[PDB]
Design a protein around this nucleic acid. Structure first.
Ligand SMILES: [Mg+2]
Ligand SMILES: [Mg+2]
Ligand SMILES: [Mg+2]
Ligand SMILES: [Mg+2]
Ligand SMILES: [Mg+2]
Ligand SMILES: [Mg+2]
Ligand SMILES: [Mg+2]
Lengths: 102, 140, 94, 75, 59, 286, 149, 100, 166, 40
RNA sequence: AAAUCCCCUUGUAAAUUUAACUGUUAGUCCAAAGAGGAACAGCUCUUUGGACACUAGGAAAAAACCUUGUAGAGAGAGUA
RNA sequence: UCCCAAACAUAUAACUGAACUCCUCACACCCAAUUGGACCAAUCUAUCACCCUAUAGAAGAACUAAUGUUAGUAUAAGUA
């Protein structure tokens, strides 16, 4: 998934990352970094030494119940299933860049 | 041994609770409510496919609106960015247009510059060198 | 006005249908794909005599595994601990 | 034609599969030539060895490069 | 843009008057570029549930 | 009559739930509810906050003067020994004095051009009644608060919150408390505008004096953009020009409100509280 | 369905994790019966795991009450006031441990439909789009088909 | 001489490629409205012995004309100005969720 | 059966401190098993709903419907015990809060028809409920003015956000 | 969109097929410890 | 006449036998070859194949035409 | 019974488009009749349990539908 993130925001990943809550990680796949006056683009990804972004796990919970119902008329076909998808919430802490354009 | 059902009140309450916000007698009569609750459940399950389709269509409309403001067409902007190795999907492109007008304008400039580069390359017979922004980064 | 007798797609008088530009474009590009397939199928690496029996050993060994798997069906072993583990259902604190 | 597709292991569409260029395989392929795409195999680095068996990658142009580094070409 | 919340929302969802000169023009082409303006389809923030339409004046 | 017990038992629980919802009981303190242990709860309080609190300081941090008076009244009625409990009045003053100084220091470095009056208001807002009460409630401060009535009054709750800050200051020190207040008080102004935290009247009135201080000519207002002037839904973009140079642009439904918004925009840029400013640095210092 | 269930926006408690992470679980209460097959999984859980779980989470208070009961229960309280009650009626030990661990990571907010998988107080840095964002300004800003002086 | 887009309304866009060609640099400083492209603010808009007090100019109007006046002043239709029944008035959520 | 309306006159509130204002007096009264249709009696109950006690009596006195005199006596005796037993100072300082009718117990009789057929007729009975609150009747809600429509429309336009985005 | 151009350049028609955008690990530990490999 | 039967290699994983019984064989439409006193269609009836009585997308609405199947969540993408 | 989307010859062929395929994760979890399994509400008994449960044995063991039976109340209707 592609996310337009900034500092101090929450995004929801519909999966478990096998990480303890409160741990801070780094996201190495950055496609675009922009500012008020300048913007830098990757082809298709920026170098690791150019931009660094880090996030902290703050929540690991299940999803609300979801209904999966299938019905066919006049065939006695009726099935119901309830699923909950594990999800994780990450808070983007800081976005850092370095003057490595040259 | 005579056995009679003693929890039928709870067996019908688990269905009536899903129809509490309906209109007419079908929100309280179990015979009517069970038939419409099933339809509501079926519609909800298949609406997830429609949500993914409709959201993409909304993004395409917004991207087209922003591009037309810059004198560009949606097919021209989408294809040229791909040729520039800029893999941005429809959502972020719509997000950039709404919230980052200056960044989106730069992307529109990049597409138009790439579009003119391809026209010049097609205009030539191949003897001319490649365009500045037409170079592709090779990965091994 | 504009009734079509019988059904739309079957019957003596159907609804007339015409091809479109992209309908053709899809057909040619499929025809070109097989033209590639036709060419690449015209250069066998070996002949029938050379290929005869060059894979008989692997085919035979694969079938023996199939035979062994089919003939190995048997009821599983029954242990005493699992039968005795049901005694734990009444376990309680002192 | 359904059985022929079953034999060649072509159940899931757009899933490449390698086959021997022999008359017996060619005979089966000719039946379903209208449902499949046939391309030759290229080995610019040759047949892979045991050391690099996990480093192979079949590129879309039809060759199996044995050195997959996921790194931009310095050239 | 350091705008306050109420003025920022007001400006974003404002209504813009457009003028069209139909002299020696095909009605369909005039109607074509007027429908987008009336529906607000030219706005990047457009949505059907949002009353984002604009005013169109044709002479 | 149908023989059986489970169905009737399930129905009784459902009716009691309806009876509970029909007239919910008045709220009661968590301590009076079962499964409570003041020693155990206050011990985990420090570990939950990842701090090494002092048991004596923390225990007396939640003691309020009203609670002491109520206990003295209760024992007087019973006619019964003397208590040696100390109220958190001195601890609250230490926490309040340090928090005001620490907040003022933190904001001055982040916004050097912020005027002193603007600095005071933001500290007043952060140390406001609702901000500490919202933080204290979400930090389970009110649960451990020893008061005379429930729920704890906001003035008492605010005093208790500043008390534990002083207790941490005595137990740990200024450097550890500075990180604590930054993590729980600075974070309360993330997505709020400068004037959403500092209410001001006549933004243009003090904008002129600010440009007077900066030795700049008076701003003049001009209409950059206009739409629907004669209708009921107008839009006016009023910009301010000094020496025929734009400094700010402000929208509004009328000319007057657009001019005030333009003044607010200029003040935000002058004071460095723009939405484009770099986010606060929460990283641990090197 | 969503139309029949209240929803909320994605959010946290007091910007948890911005400066430091605070464990949202605050209290745990366990009801265990000394005798009864329904509490066997709960009983063995506290014989071997409740001690290790307590050391792992020092900010969470755990209460273990042993009284006669037909359905063992666990009650979790969070700092926001939310209360969650889960039954331990006839489950194993490896699955109560997962169940107990799940409540620790939860923030205590309502588990309902989330309108947006993302939330930010500053969606734009260069300014939100407005109709005049991409509109050039003419000399003196004359309106169309109007004259001056 | 060349410019992909006319840089006169939103921002001047400059495009550059890095030395290795693996990154695209876009510098887009914002533009400002010239002083000559603005209008001045429209500031301009007897023997009296009695104080001129605020008089009641609110005249009562019937449901018909009042809706018609609302429709023409807001350029909307007449349908939205009619009241709704109790069934719809109660299904409305008085406490909606709030974001941003 | 249920007779909760009668017991509503037996609830007693604790004495009020001088700080809080005066709690208006309320009286619950009802007449059971009236030989009348609940649908027909509903019109009379709705008519006198929200009006003063003495104005309601004047309206009911000159009404031609049979149920009018029944309610008139019910209102009269409700006013009597209000002053006598419910600490009501002025007997004319009362207004009707809620007036409604409920279905009573009814009998089933046979109505003969031609060709040997029959139809089950019903002898309808109904109850009438009324609550009186001390004090002048509240003013009716004024019609919503055009300016009220104007601000409401503005509020809807100002409350819209950009949907399906950040 | 853009699939034919990708095939000519020697890449996958689907940008998510193979390459650094999908094959490379998405995250790693803050201190620099590499993340465990993903199941996909 | 299109084609069938038989059938080593090869591709593949099924096939035969034994034990135990239920249920279906009042079918429809399309492509093709036919038959119904030497009937261009229509009506009825055989043979081969496909679809339908199983999902979705597209032909306006669409059981039988084209695309496509093995099952969930996603506010990703490439295509038919 | 009343035509029937509205339109448009001129800005460089891409773009749009599925439950097909790919991506994060998880996978027993979209066919009639029929067949094979995995579970289970409620009730009685044996033993447990003791704010309502557990292991076994048993059976008058589960109703959106038979112009189904009995009882209650609506619709037509405050109508004939
Ligand atoms: Mg027809
Ligand atoms: Mg007779
Ligand atoms: Mg699939
Ligand atoms: Mg699967
Ligand atoms: Mg039965
Ligand atoms: Mg029946
Ligand atoms: Mg009638």
């Amino acid at each position: 998934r592609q996310w337009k993130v900034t500092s101090e925001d929450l995004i929801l990943i519909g999966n478990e990352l096998d990480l303890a809550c409160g741990e801070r990680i780094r996201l190495e796949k950055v496609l675009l970094v922009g500012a008020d006056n300048f913007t830098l683009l990757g082809k298709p990804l920026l170098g690791k030494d150019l931009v660094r972004v880090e996030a902290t796990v703050i929540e690991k919970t299940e999803s609300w119940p979801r209904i999966i119902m299938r019905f066919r008329k006049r065939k006695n076909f009726k099935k119901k299933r309830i699923v909950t998808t594990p999800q994780t919430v990450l808070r983007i802490n800081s976005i850092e860049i370095a003057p490595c354009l040259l | 041994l005579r056995n009679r059902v003693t929890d039928r009140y709870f067996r019908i309450q688990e269905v009536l609770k899903h129809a509490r916000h309906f209109r007419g007698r079908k929100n309280r009569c179990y015979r009517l409510a069970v038939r419409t609750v099933i339809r509501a459940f079926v519609k909800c399950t298949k609406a997830r496919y429609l949500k993914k389709k409709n959201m993409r269509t909304l993004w395409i409309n917004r991207i087209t609106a922003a591009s037309q403001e810059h004198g560009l067409k949606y097919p021209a902007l989408i294809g040229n960015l791909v040729k520039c190795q800029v893999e941005l999907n429809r959502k972020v492109l719509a997000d950039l247009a709404i919230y980052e007008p200056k960044t989106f304008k730069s992307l529109a400039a990049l597409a138009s510059r790439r579009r003119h580069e391809g026209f010049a390359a097609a205009l030539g017979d191949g003897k001319e060198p490649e365009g500045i922004f037409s170079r592709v980064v090779q990965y091994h | 006005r504009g009734r079509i007798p019988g059904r739309q797609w079957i019957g003596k008088h159907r609804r007339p249908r015409f091809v479109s530009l992209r309908a053709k474009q899809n057909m040619i590009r499929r025809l070109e794909i097989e033209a590639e397939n036709h060419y690449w199928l015209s250069m066998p690496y070996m002949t029938r005599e050379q290929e005869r029996g060059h894979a008989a050993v692997r085919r035979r060994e694969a079938f023996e595994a199939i035979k062994a798997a089919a003939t190995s069906k048997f009821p599983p072993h029954r242990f005493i601990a699992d039968q005795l583990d049901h005694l734990n259902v009444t376990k309680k604190w002192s | 034609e359904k059985d022929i597709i079953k034999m060649l292991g072509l159940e899931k569409a757009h899933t490449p599969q390698v086959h021997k260029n022999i008359p017996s395989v060619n005979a089966k392929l000719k039946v379903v030539k209208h449902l499949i795409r046939i391309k030759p195999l290229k080995l610019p680095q040759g047949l892979p060895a045991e050391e690099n068996m996990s480093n192979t990658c079949l590129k879309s142009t039809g060759e199996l490069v044995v050195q997959w580094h996921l790194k931009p070409v310095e050239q | 843009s350091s705008f306050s919340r109420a003025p920022q929302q007001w400006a974003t969802f404002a209504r813009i008057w457009y003028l069209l000169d139909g002299k020696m023009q095909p009605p369909g082409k005039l109607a074509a570029m007027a429908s987008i303006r009336l529906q607000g389809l030219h706005k990047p923030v457009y949505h059907a549930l949002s009353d984002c339409g604009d005013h169109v004046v044709i002479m | 009559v149908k023989k059986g017990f489970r169905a009737a038992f399930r129905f009784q629980k459902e009716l009691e739930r309806q009876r509970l919802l029909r007239c919910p009981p008045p709220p009661v303190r968590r301590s009076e509810k079962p499964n409570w242990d003041y020693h155990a709860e206050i011990q985990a309080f420090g570990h939950r906050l990842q701090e090494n609190f002092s048991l004596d300081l923390l225990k007396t941090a939640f003691v309020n003067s009203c609670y002491i008076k109520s206990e003295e009244a209760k024992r007087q009625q019973l006619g019964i020994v003397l208590l040696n409990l100390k109220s958190n009045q001195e601890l609250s003053e230490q926490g309040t004095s340090f928090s005001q100084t620490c907040l003022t220091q933190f904001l001055e470095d982040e916004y050097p051009d912020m005027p002193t009056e603007g600095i005071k208001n933001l500290v007043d807002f952060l140390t406001g009644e609702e901000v500490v009460c919202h933080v204290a409630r979400n930090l389970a401060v009110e649960q451990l608060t020893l008061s005379e009535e429930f729920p704890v009054p906001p003035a008492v709750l605010q005093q208790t919150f500043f008390a534990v800050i002083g207790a941490l200051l005595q137990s740990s020190g200024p450097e550890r408390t500075a990180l604590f207040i930054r993590d729980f008080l600075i974070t309360q102004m993330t997505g709020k505008e400068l004037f959403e935290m500092w209410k001001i009247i006549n933004p243009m009135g003090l904008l002129v004096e600010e440009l007077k201080k900066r030795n700049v000519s008076a701003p003049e207002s001009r209409l950059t953009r206009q739409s629907g002037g004669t209708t009921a839904l107008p839009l006016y973009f009023v910009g301010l020009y000094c020496d025929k140079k734009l400094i700010a642009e402000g929208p509004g439904e009328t000319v007057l409100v657009a001019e005030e918004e333009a003044a607010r925009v200029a003040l935000r840029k002058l004071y460095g509280f723009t939405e484009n400013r770099r986010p606060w640095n929460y990283s641990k210092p090197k | 369905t969503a139309r029949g269930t209240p929803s909320r926006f994605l959010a946290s408690v007091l910007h948890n994790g911005l400066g430091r992470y605070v464990q949202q679980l605050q209290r745990l209460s366990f009801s265990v019966s000394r005798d009864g097959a329904s509490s066997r999984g709960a009983r063995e859980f506290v014989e071997r795991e409740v001690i290790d779980f307590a050391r792992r989470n020092p900010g969470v208070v755990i209460y273990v009450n042993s009284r006669p009961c037909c359905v063992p229960r666990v009650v979790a309280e969070y700092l926001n006031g939310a209360v969650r009650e889960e039954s331990i009626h006839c489950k194993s030990v490896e699955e109560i441990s997962t169940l107990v661990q799940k409540l620790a990571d939860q923030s205590g907010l309502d588990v309902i439909r989330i309108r947006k998988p993302f939330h930010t107080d500053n969606p734009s840095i260069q300014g939100q789009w407005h109709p005049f964002t991409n509109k050039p300004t003419t000399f003196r800003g004359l309106r169309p088909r109007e004259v001056q002086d | 001489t060349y410019s992909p887009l006319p840089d006169d309304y939103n921002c001047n866009v400059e495009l550059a490629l890095t030395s290795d060609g693996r990154t695209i640099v876009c510098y887009h400083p914002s533009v400002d409205i010239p002083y000559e492209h603005t209008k001045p603010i429209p500031r301009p808009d007897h023997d009296q012995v009695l104080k001129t007090r605020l008089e009641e100019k609110v005249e009562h109007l019937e449901e018909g004309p009042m809706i018609e006046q609302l429709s023409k002043m807001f350029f909307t239709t007449k349908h939205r100005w009619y009241p709704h029944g109790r069934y719809h008035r109660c299904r409305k959520n008085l406490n909606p969720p709030k974001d941003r | 059966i249920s007779r909760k309306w009668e017991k509503k006159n037996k609830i007693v509130y604790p004495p009020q401190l001088p700080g809080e204002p005066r709690r208006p007096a309320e009286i619950y009264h009802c007449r059971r098993q009236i030989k009348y249709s609940k649908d027909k009696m509903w019109y009379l109950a709705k008519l006198i709903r929200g009006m003063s006690i003495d104005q309601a009596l004047a309206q009911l006195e000159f009404n031609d419907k049979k149920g009018a005199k029944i309610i008139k006596e019910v209102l009269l005796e409700a006013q009597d015990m209000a002053v006598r037993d419910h600490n009501v100072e002025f007997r004319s300082n009362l207004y009707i809060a809620e007036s409604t009718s409920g279905r009573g117990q009814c009998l089933k009789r046979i109505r003969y028809h031609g060709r040997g057929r029959f139809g089950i007729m019903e002898k309808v009975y109904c109850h009438y409920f009324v609550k009186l609150v001390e004090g002048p009747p509240p003013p009716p809600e004024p019609p919503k003015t055009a300016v009220a429509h104007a601000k409401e429309y503005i509020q809807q336009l100002r409350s819209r956000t950009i949907v399906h985005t950040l | 969109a853009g699939g034919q151009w990708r095939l000519q350049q020697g890449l996958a028609a689907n940008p998510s097929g193979y390459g650094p955008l999908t094959e490379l690990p998405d995250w790693s530990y803050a201190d620099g410890r590499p993340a465990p490999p993903m199941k996909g």
